[PDB]
Design a protein around this ligand. Structure first.
Ligand SMILES: Nc1nc2c(ncn2[C@@H]2O[C@H](COP(=O)(O)OP(=O)(O)OP(=O)(O)O)[C@@H](O)[C@H]2O)c(=O)[nH]1
Ligand SMILES: Nc1nc2c(ncn2[C@@H]2O[C@H](COP(=O)(O)OP(=O)(O)OP(=O)(O)O)[C@@H](O)[C@H]2O)c(=O)[nH]1
Ligand SMILES: Nc1nc2c(ncn2[C@@H]2O[C@H](COP(=O)(O)OP(=O)(O)O)[C@@H](O)[C@H]2O)c(=O)[nH]1
Ligand SMILES: [Mg+2]
Ligand SMILES: [Mg+2]
Lengths: 57, 54, 430, 442, 46, 28, 442
């Protein structure tokens, strides 16, 4: 192998199935990452609405 | 005593369906008076959730 | 899924005229041809029997053929006669003479090309063609000869479709013509090869229906042709209206015929009951099934108790529960178990349709495939052999040109049909 | 997250109407013109996503196809007030039926229509990001349901591979019958379904009629009642995907827990608080009563008796106001009973699920309102008796080739009958062998 | 033909009869080399 | 007949309804 | 900046009417060539300049000539609604048609009219300062379109030299046909077109009929629908010249990127959101769905199947609200598919362009309104199948010299048929050779 680290190079070419945390270039990974960031924003919004009433001031 | 005759689907699942809401209608009925509806949606363009505040 | 009708001979043209009155009434078509109905369910399957002419009008998909125009002028003079397309009336210049061979070979080949041209022209215009429907008598002359000629030609040209015939057959006692056995035997020989499914009616059975069940004081041919039009319009009802368990002519044929020669069926219609008497009947599925199996309501002279049911089918019209139908058919099969052929685990098919015939709350039509029809064929073969052994009237047919070997072949084929019915009647598991 | 529904033939479309009526009413999908004009839940939540996709203008559309060879039933859905929902491409209808012939559906007619169905399913499957199975509704007694169902599952199994396929199937009842040729079609169907399905749910119409007579008070039931019961069962099984709960259960957990060996995938289904409104106000309905109820044969939706066999696995789905401690007490009481028996090689026989959403009430419906319900799917050797009776009826007819000429005319070799009958015989022998104790002399 | 009315049925790209030419839904693809591995180990001053 | 497939002429076809249909309003 | 349009014969003039209708409606020029007198946006932008020139009084006039040998179509233009838009010198008409004879157009009749055409084109080219190509619309099936189109392209190619010439050509459909002598005219046209055109776009009426039946809901299409689709395609291709964008594409970049070898210049064209109004409101139309759409054969406007060949290059033009990251993800997903194949000597198969101006909606039109669209032109070896069927029909007719006496009487040697057919045979062999997988690397 031309790489200094052989294990990383070998693991890179092994095919993968997880399309979760944004790693792929396909459309599914992008859509899922967008869903995750939207969900995080919504959850923070609701929690701030229900506990932190003095944030905006 | 046999003037009204429904079929089973219309009698069970969609009983309140008037004759004016089916695909086939006469050619001399007005269309402007009928409200527009061409899809199914949770809200009727309701302001509580569609508006984004800022 | 559209049916094309052919009406042949006097009996066929009269029954057809009454049939198209009944069908036009059920779909709300005025005698001018204008649609005047009051629900889309009537309109949405009108194509099945009618073609659409320009601005409203409907025309009925039927061909009328006869050898003397007297009948044609009578139907054209009738109350709905105007609806028929003028170019669809085909007639010759000399009568059938009540002779099968003349009607089949001499005037038949003269006219047959124009009827086949019209029938092909009408069939090929359809986007998908279902079977043909033919009404004729088997005892006559032009009905038997030209009907079977046309049947053979349509079977050559459209072998992948379904072929259905409705046929009137001679009473053993009430003959209308002396030479009935020859015409009947030759026509049944032709039909058993060409046809896919054939329905048979005895005028004697209709007479006994009218007198015993309807108690009519002075019945007329309009009543008999109304009974026939009722059963005919009932068989096609699942083709043209919604229901909980749809059915089709091809689905009926596949479930009714165990072997391809066994395709002759008896018919009945249940909510028959005479005017005036306070008893209503037919208000529930047990009443219809009990009347349905009563021999008073069956359209053949043979009685089921002398034979066995291979298969049966019931088509129900009206708003009803499937349980009452299913449990009634099970109870009838269990209680009368000796009359059902034992190597088939369930002999009855049921079907349920939402839309009843006009003026009845509910109705059912019954179709039965029973081996007792063999007694009728035996009867025809006996009368034929009595006449043929003595050369009783053969010179007319031979003068038209038939070889006697056709008569001996047709007799042998009918005798083999009788033998096949008898062997399947007496078969056993062993 | 996503699931795609495929409806085939007459039973599958009629059950589909009830299913989509129920899922609409549970989520709140209404006509856009028809404003609620009333108090509603009013909480914008992701739960629709399992069954709906948004256009971005906020219209909802459902993840379903309707497949039929005769026009009448699909043309009936195109004419109602439910036309506004489906995308018109989703409603696919042919010209003419398969006429109760499996050979006609599989070889002659379904072969023309099948490529449109696969293209539509692909267009659906491309608009997903966590598809976790197909739900299929069909009957194996009729011609198009058998032939096109087999052909479509074969193509799906090659193209999509490992993805799970769960079927809800209406089988021919053991003595109520509607058509003569039912045994031939059911045997030939079952041959294809054996190889190409991950879980198969078993239904008998005679059992659901008996259940509606005994428990509900209906003298004259009709197909809409049975289809509403089926819809409730499907809603209970898919509720685990759609709402919050204490113990969730993903659809892959059913397949991992219920199927011990790859051929042993035919399962029985039952539902507990099937009760009428007049009885419902006379009785409390605690957890232990409904847990005891689901094991009585009067509760089952398939006509088989489990006392003549042994359980291999049970999966119990509880929905509504239930607490895990009561589930544990109920399961321990069930475990004590002597008329409930498990094969000795399956010691931990139960899986539990607990979901907070109670079952919905439909305005025209016949079920009562209840705070909790439980639904069971279980694997048992008793199922072998249903196949033995179908095979005996097939043998009776096939000894004389009673109807074979239709099938031979529509394109099938006579040899195919004997192959299918031997494969179902081998399935019977599998159920005989698997249930035999591995006792060892010592 | 099968669709009805068209001059000819359009060819299909998604699916095929031949199992060795059809297109599987679950494409079994490659991970980028960046998001794997450990990375440099960096120490603070206590 | 010019040594062909019989002296019969096949009439044409009028309409060809498709598989998928629209759900917009239809008039008599 | 500038482009000159040349319209030849009946199809080319009728398609021109739809094109200039569309270009007027996109810029906002009234049918009489005057800008809206009541509109006061103030930013009198230069975008028209690609297609219009100003006099100085503010009337607009378009950079086109209409050429025909029969009067009727040009008199229809003269008497129609756009009478005042065109300069009367631009509308050139002969006395009598070429009667489906290539020989009549090329030798006998077009030779008198051709010098007026060259004088008009010169008068246009003198009123330019950055001419960057010719757009030509014609059909190769008819006599004047073939003969005069070839003669005029030859003269333009000698006089102007290096300037690019792009043709939009309607080829004879593989079983739809309109005249008996179409193969002869198409062969003789293609012989001249091979030497003297830079890119040739292929159209088949049978494909646009199929597309209008399947995707749109039109039961009874006519030529105006096809001509509006062609006009939309041409507007999409020329939009890159007229409006701001992220990745512009000059007409010379198309020519540089699409043609690998100087004979291999025949390209396929497709358009994505061909959709009806009822389907369009049921579905979202994101970038990945339309990118998947442009590759399905149901979208193409030419009757060929690309699975029997290999793609060499694709050029994808996106217009409307699209973001480059979505284009990159889409192209990588298309590249992943196994039923889409590129020749192994072309690893980097795609060129992208992205423009912000969305497609215009025409008052009488049949397309839905959409926020974005994509248009593709691609080079593929499958086109060799299109030539082989024309050559087979030529061989069938030419074996008996079925009609040749007309051509020989109007002035053409019999030898020209065999020469042209041998040149098309060589073009077939070129497409066989370029598409062969080279095994020298392994
Ligand atoms: N539970 C239930 N069973 C049904 C329903 N409809 C039909 N069945 C049963 O299913 C069997 C008939 O199968 P069908 O669905 O009619 O067959 P098919 O799919 O229409 O096949 P074709 O007749 O060729 O079109 C019988 O046992 C019926 O009792 C229904 O709506 N609900
Ligand atoms: N798409 C499209 N094709 C057309 C149109 N008009 C004609 N065609 C096609 O083009 C071919 C006929 O070519 P024409 O334009 O009529 O030939 P021409 O240029 O008039 O040549 P002459 O007949 O000698 O005057 C046929 O294949 C027609 O189908 C049109 O308006 N739109
Ligand atoms: N049911 C019924 N039977 C008829 C009618 N007309 C004639 N028949 C019977 O048909 C047989 C006579 O056949 P026919 O039609 O005269 O033969 P044709 O001379 O060839 O037309 C006799 O049994 C008649 O009773 C009719 O209108 N209805
Ligand atoms: Mg069916
Ligand atoms: Mg011309």
């Amino acid at each position: 192998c031309p790489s200094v680290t052989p294990q990383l190079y070998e693991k890179s070419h092994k095919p993968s199935v997880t399309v979760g945390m944004g790693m792929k270039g396909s459309a599914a990974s992008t859509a899922c990452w967008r869903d995750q960031v939207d969900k995080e924003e919504q959850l923070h919004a609701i929690w701030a609405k229900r506990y932190d009433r003095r944030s905006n001031a | 005593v046999l003037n009204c005759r429904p079929t089973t689907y219309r009698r069970d699942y969609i009983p309140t369906a008037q004759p004016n809401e089916y695909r086939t209608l006469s050619h001399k009925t007005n269309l402007q008076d009928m409200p527009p509806s061409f899809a199914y949606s949770t809200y009727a363009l309701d302001d509580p959730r569609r508006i984004i505040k800022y | 899924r559209e049916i094309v009708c052919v009406q042949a001979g006097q009996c066929g043209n009269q029954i057809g005229s009454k049939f198209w009155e009944v069908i036009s009434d059920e779909h709300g078509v005025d005698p001018t041809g204008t649609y005047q109905g009051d629900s889309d369910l009537q309109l949405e399957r009108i194509n099945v029997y009618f073609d659409e002419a320009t601005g409203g009008r409907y025309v009925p998909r039927s061909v009328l053929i006869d050898l003397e125009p007297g009948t044609m002028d009578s139907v054209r003079a009738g109350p709905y006669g105007q609806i028929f397309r003028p170019d669809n009336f085909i007639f010759g210049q000399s009568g059938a003479g009540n002779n099968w061979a003349k009607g089949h070979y001499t005037e038949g080949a003269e006219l047959i090309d124009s009827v086949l041209d019209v029938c092909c022209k009408e069939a090929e215009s359809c986007d998908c063609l279902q079977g043909f429907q033919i009404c004729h008598s088997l005892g006559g002359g032009t009905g038997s000869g030209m009907g079977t000629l046309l049947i053979s030609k349509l079977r050559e040209q459209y072998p992948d479709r379904i072929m259905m015939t409705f046929s009137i057959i001679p009473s053993p006692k009430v003959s209308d013509t002396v030479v009935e056995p020859y015409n009947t035997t030759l026509s049944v020989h032709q039909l058993v090869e060409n046809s896919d499914e054939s329905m048979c009616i005895d005028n004697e059975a209709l007479y006994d229906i009218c007198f015993r069940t309807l108690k009519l004081t002075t019945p007329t041919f309009g009543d008999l042709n109304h009974l026939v039009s009722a059963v005919v319009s009932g068989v096609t009802c699942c083709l043209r209206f919604p229901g909980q368990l749809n059915s089709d002519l091809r689905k009926l044929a596949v479930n009714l015929v165990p072997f391809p020669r066994l395709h002759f069926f008896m018919m009945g219609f249940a909510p028959l009951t005479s005017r005036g008497s306070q008893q209503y009947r037919g208000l529930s599925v047990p009443e219809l099934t009990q009347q349905m199996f009563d021999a008073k309501n069956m359209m053949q002279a043979a009685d089921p108790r002398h034979g066995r049911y291979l298969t049966a089918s019931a088509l129900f019209r009206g708003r009803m529960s499937t349980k009452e139908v299913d449990e009634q058919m099970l109870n009838v099969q269990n209680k009368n178990s000796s009359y059902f052929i034992e190597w088939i685990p369930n002999n009855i098919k049921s079907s349920v349709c939402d839309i009843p015939p006009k003026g009845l709350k509910m109705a059912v039509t019954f179709i039965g495939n029973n081996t007792c029809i063999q007694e009728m064929f035996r009867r025809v073969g006996e009368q034929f052999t009595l006449m043929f052994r003595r050369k009783a009237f053969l010179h007319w047919y031979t003068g038209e040109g038939m070889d006697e070997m056709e008569f001996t072949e047709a007799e042998s084929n009918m005798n083999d049909l009788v033998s096949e019915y008898q062997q399947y009647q007496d078969a056993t598991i062993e | 997250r996503e699931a795609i529904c495929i409806h085939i033939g007459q039973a599958g479309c009629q059950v589909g109407n009830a299913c989509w009526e129920l899922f609409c009413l549970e989520h709140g999908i209404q006509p856009d013109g028809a404003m609620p004009s009333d108090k509603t839940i009013g909480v914008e939540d992701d739960a629709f996503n399992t069954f709906f996709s948004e256009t971005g203008a906020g219209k909802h559309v459902p993840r379903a196809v309707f497949l039929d060879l005769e026009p009448t039933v699909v043309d009936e859905v195109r004419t109602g007030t439910y036309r506004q929902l489906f995308h018109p491409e989703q409603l696919i209808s042919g010209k003419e039926d398969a006429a109760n012939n499996y050979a006609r559906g599989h070889y002659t007619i379904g072969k023309e229509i099948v490529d449109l169905c696969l293209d539509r399913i692909r267009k659906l499957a491309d608009n997903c990001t966590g598809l976790q199975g197909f739900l299929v509704y069909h009957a194996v007694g009729g011609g198009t349901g058998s032939g096109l169902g087999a052909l479509l599952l074969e193509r799906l199994s090659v193209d999509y591979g490992k993805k799970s396929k769960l079927g809800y199937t209406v089988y021919p009842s053991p003595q109520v019958s509607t058509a003569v040729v039912e045994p031939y079609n059911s045997v030939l169907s079952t041959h294809s379904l054996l190889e190409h399905t991950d879980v198969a749910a078993m239904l008998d119409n005679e059992a659901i009629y008996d259940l509606t007579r005994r428990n509900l008070d209906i003298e004259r039931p009709t197909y809409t009642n049975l289809n509403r019961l089926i819809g409730q069962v499907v809603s209970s099984l898919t509720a685990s995907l759609r709402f919050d709960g204490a113990l969730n259960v993903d659809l892959t957990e059913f397949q991992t827990n219920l199927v011990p060996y790859p051929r042993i995938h035919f399962v029985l289904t039952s539902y507990a608080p099937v009760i009428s409104a007049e009885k419902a106000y006379h009785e409390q309905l605690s957890v232990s009563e409904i847990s005891n109820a689901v094991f009585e044969p009067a509760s089952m939706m398939t006509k088989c008796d489990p006392r003549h066999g042994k359980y291999m696995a049970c999966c119990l789905m509880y929905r509504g106001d239930v607490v895990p401690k009561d589930v544990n007490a109920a399961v321990a009481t069930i475990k004590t009973k002597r008329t409930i028996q498990f094969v000795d090689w399956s010691p931990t026989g139960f899986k539990c699920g607990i979901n907070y959403q109670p079952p919905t009430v439909v305005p025209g419906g016949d079920l009562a309102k209840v705070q909790r319900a439980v639904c069971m799917i279980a694997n048992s050797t008793a199922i072998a008796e249903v196949f033995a009776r179908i095979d005996h009826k097939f043998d009776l007819m096939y000894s004389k080739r009673a109807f074979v000429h239709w099938y031979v005319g529509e394109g099938m070799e006579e040899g195919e009958f004997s192959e299918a009958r031997e494969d179902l015989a081998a399935l019977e022998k599998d159920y005989e062998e698997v249930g035999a104790e591995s006792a060892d002399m010592d | 033909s099968a669709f009805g009315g068209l001059f000819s049925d359009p060819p299909l790209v998604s699916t095929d009869i031949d199992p060795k030419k059809t297109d599987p839904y679950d494409k079994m693809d490659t991970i980028p080399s960046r998001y794997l591995g450990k990375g440099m180990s960096i120490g603070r001053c206590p | 007949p010019p040594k062909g497939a019989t002296g019969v002429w096949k009439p044409n076809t009028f309409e060809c309804t498709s598989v998928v249909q629209s759900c917009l309003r239809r008039f008599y």
